[model samples]
Target: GSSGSSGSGEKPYKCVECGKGYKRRLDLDFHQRVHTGEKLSGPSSG
Candidate 1:
């Protein structure tokens, strides 16, 4: 399926700053934090 294409070595999302690639859009969004200097901190359990 097309959804699984990324896992097959076909990354579609690319970082503009470093040109690094990601398998999913979420990964690209997360990577943006690295450039924006945003801290995610650890998650808290309820």
Candidate 2:
């Protein structure tokens, strides 16, 4: 069925730790920060 294609699309980027699916590679990389402890900003000493 032609309609099946809509739901059958596969998500290529998946999180190894949580099994979360990401539509884009960049989003997956951003999400990995939690698992890798890779901070995007510097610590504030204030």
Candidate 3:
């Protein structure tokens, strides 16, 4: 399991489609959904 943190305090996860850098891999993964045509999940129903 790999965690995000480049240890440089920089946004290192670059988007291959838009060239946008993200501070966390989770953010990048969410961003990639925009290009992949994946709809974001709805808010949790507590």
Name the top TM-score candidate: 1
Q: How large an RMSD does model 1 have?
A: 8.3
Give model 1's TM-score versus the native structure. 0.57
lDDT of 2 by residue, 1-46 (tens): 4564235557999999987778998999989889988657888879
Query: In candidate 3, where is summed lDDT lowest over 10 consecutive residues?
Result: 4-13
lDDT of 1 by residue, 1-46 (tens): 4574343466889899887789898989998888989766888988
Clashes by residue pair, model 2: none
Clashing pairs in 3: none
- On TM-score, who's better, 1 or 2? 1
Per-model CA lDDT versus the true structure: 0.81, 0.83, 0.83
Candidate 1 wrong stretches, greater than 4 Å = 1-8, 39-46
Residue 38 miss distance in model 3 (angstroms): 4.6
The reply for model 2, stretches above 4 Å from the true place, is: 1-9, 38-46
**What's the C-alpha lDDT at position 38 in model 1?**
71
Error of 2 at 13 (Å): 0.9
The local lDDT score (0 to 100) that residue 31 gets in candidate 3 is 85
Better of 1 and 3 by TM-score: 1
